[model samples]
Target: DTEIIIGICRKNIPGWKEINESYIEVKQIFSGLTNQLFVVSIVNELKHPRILFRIYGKHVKFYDSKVELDVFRYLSNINIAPNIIADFPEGRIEEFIDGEPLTTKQLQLTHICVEVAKNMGSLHIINSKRADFPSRFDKEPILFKRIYLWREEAKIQVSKNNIDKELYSKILEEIDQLEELIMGGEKFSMERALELKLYSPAFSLVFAHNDLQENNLLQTQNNIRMIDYEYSAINFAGADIANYFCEYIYDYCSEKQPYFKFKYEDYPCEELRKLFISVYLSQTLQEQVMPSQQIVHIMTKAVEVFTLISHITWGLWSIAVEFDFTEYANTRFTHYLQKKKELIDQGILPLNSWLFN
Candidate 1:
């Protein structure tokens, strides 16, 4: 019944290390969650090499080492992380969870949804900042960050390859115009709007995990172990949520047809979406999230209109834009943006939507 299916070196655990201290071995596990992953066999020094298994792999661990360390250290103070048996340069060997990953099917279950919500509630207790934007897991700034990323994407398109010089110029000109609208507001008092526009300054600082994603999260019987924490930064809360959901929504739409099939009236349980949002709201609130609404408003305006314009260009520019690939992805982002524009134009989704802070 027991056989080694693969060689030790071939195992996915990154940076194979001091095996003499503990008879370490690796076994492949299926989960694209990490770029690479393997079960680690830690031989108990006192016993007859009893196996103490843990998870480690290069794909995600290396990418998230620093933040993970910070998070682990933080959790250690609170006794949240499992046993830290061994620490290596490539990865940390900790008490392995006996729980399974949250599957798409599990995502549909209500009780499980509540459990996920509860875990999120518990995690926000740490008063953490944005280290990584977990898609859908953090949904508040989904709109704002998407605009920021898309804008960069647009600018990148202009610079990387050849495009209509006029179009590029026009985009810059539009950005200038957008800046004017944003700076016109009175709340922006720290520095002149012109100064901000000139520098493309980042708005208010807040802690965030720059790489907040489900893959970075692990669900256990009583806790959610967020693994990777490398992308942690202090930035706009909206930016974090936006980063998380832009990819979540984009990915969701990719596999689904017609994209925006959910309607306010006939849609299925908003509970799942609510579950994700509740956890985020709890965390953001606890962190005392004070986002720059003025900036968020301006970004919304710029991104909404820009999306409309981009869509009008469609295939003409789609091939060059880079991030956008499938026809549906472009169509969906375009549609989402257009809806926002309509809301803004109709005074539904308004500027000055949220009062300061």
Candidate 2:
């Protein structure tokens, strides 16, 4: 099995013929829920000893590879992400950075949080100028599109008797009811939609990582570097902020077993959130004059609404994955789904109607 894996890695990376199989070592890196990751080491090599190999998981079919490749190129060109060693059909081999992945506790520190915000803000600013570059970004919001598509997939699974009909129906009914209440029978024309997108709190459209969970951030001595671009697409800058904040509570692990535990209440305190928002605003709007009190208040409210949407977005994603991949039955996903339901049932959820209000 080790030889088979080494052979596959050798095929992907060029100019590795001098390294014998006995000297080649492949060690699996267990963290992400979406892909199978491994670190390949050539014991004899001095200059470049290690490389990261990722085998795309079952959900690869849901992503657009061409767009992902283009985005990766753009990020690497700017020296924002890891360099690609070789691109494969399913996945790729990439240059590995020897750094520690910051824990949730480490991320909450004010200095580290500021650094993270700066890294993210730089990414948003750099990607905002895509018109000057050849890599054309998908203008549409990928998360919004994926949410609706996943709902449909879940319904299909229910019809096929693949999953629990009752659960699927309940979730769908809740989503439909919530949408109607949020829309309030008002239909937006393309003109009006564009107008709202331009002014909405979390709708500052830009090419975004879309998934900015702490695990995706690698903390080296000099600076922080972001990895994992399969989920990157054009989306709300505010949504990226809110989603990373939501990661403070959400625990993503494989179905193989639970990977980590959380002290839920320890994170996402009001003071910590304020600090994050303050730092993010400072970094993102450094060139512009500081916002007025009224403007800061509005952005604060927008972040809250966007954070809720971020949670629900992932909740929908988990529901759909259950339908698509029969092997996906993680307790964390179930807990997240329940958490979304509770928010709605308790009347504490932020609806689109409330968002604009």
Candidate 3:
């Protein structure tokens, strides 16, 4: 499809007036995820230069591509992301960032973690600047809604499938148990959970980079820039941070069964997590100015709760959406059960009954 890519370059980007299909060099990159990524470069780059070509993957029925495109334009304009060159229905061409993806080990460094925390807050600062977004947040936070909806969507895929029915049923059962543990048993709705104070604390309703894994964070000369915004949207502040901590254990570089290695000892300690939350809250919550110890404790607790949410979200994502990665589903579910067990052991469920952190 170099011919098609060259045509897009000619149409949208400059200095590709007479570029031929054969003149462009296309090389596939190991993105370690579902998306098809390629580095496309032209030999004689006068105005038209190299671009990262990305085609939508099969299980892309999840996020709104329009919102993603808007995000690309918006973040790029604000110097947050790379500029968009051109876009088609199934894919997009963006200015290729010349930076290495942060390794899991590198992600543990204080310097890198600081930059990531700062950018993360800036990414979440969308609600403060936008006038209309706060209205939507008044309804329900996005992550929970998506989590609930994905169960129903998976149910639709339950009866009509070519894959293992047993596996699908097991995931559905896990979802039910998740509902019980998080929502005071399986029959509860979002309103009921929110009313019972079973969901989360005062984690702000803001735009979030839901997936902040190491690979998504690219370390450049000046800064650590986040690359992928596939799962970016308005969500709970704690949810994003909780998901970040979950990723600390999962270094997705393995080529074997699970497609990622775990680093349990490398998980960020409480102090490191607090520093990240401290910086993040400072950037997002200037209304309260410097976040007090009480606020910090509350936010910290919120993050702890969502650690379970993060687990099940990705677990279900592996099975229901990206159905091929059964081991990915296994890894996520194992952690999910572990975290749930911890919560139960510590008696943290039914937030109204639990003592303050």
Count of backbone clashes for each model? 22, 0, 0
* Residues 1-357 of candidate 3: C-alpha lDDT, one tens digit per residue: 767766766777666667776677888776446778888888654644788888877653455656666666676667667777776788778888878888888867877777788889888877677553434333346676678776665555544553445554565576655555544444445566455443333346667888999888877788777877767777767788889888988877776655677855666876777777777767766544233566666566557767877877876666562224656667677777677667667666544455333
lDDT of each: 0.40, 0.63, 0.69
Candidate 2 per-residue lDDT over residues 1-357, each given as its tens digit: 578778876766666755678888899976566778889998763545788887877652255656667778777776778887777778777788878777766767878877877787777766555456454566655555666776666555546663444544555565554333322233323344355555443456666788888778888889877887767776667778877877776454333333444444544665566666666666666743133444455555555545544644665555552232332323334444665655567443544434556
Which residue pairs of candidate 3 clash? Answer: none
Per-prediction TM-score to the true structure, in the order listed: 0.47, 0.75, 0.79
lDDT tens readout by residue for model 1, 178-297: 422333343333355334333222232334554444455567677556544444434343344333333233232223444222221211133344444444444434542112333333
Cα lDDT, model 1, residue 50: 21
Ranking by TM-score: 3, 2, 1
For residue 148, model 1's alpha carbon misses the true position, in angstroms, by: 6.8
Error of 1 at 155 (Å): 6.0
**How far off is residue 330 in model 1, in Å?**
4.4
Instruction: Output the lDDT of residue 203, model 1.
Output: 32
**Error at 125, model 1, angstroms:** 4.7
Mark the 10 consecutive residues where model 3 has the least summed lDDT: 131-140
Which prediction has more favorable TM-score, 2 or 3?
3
Q: Which candidate, 1 or 2, would have the higher TM-score against the true structure? A: 2
- Whose TM-score is greatest here? 3
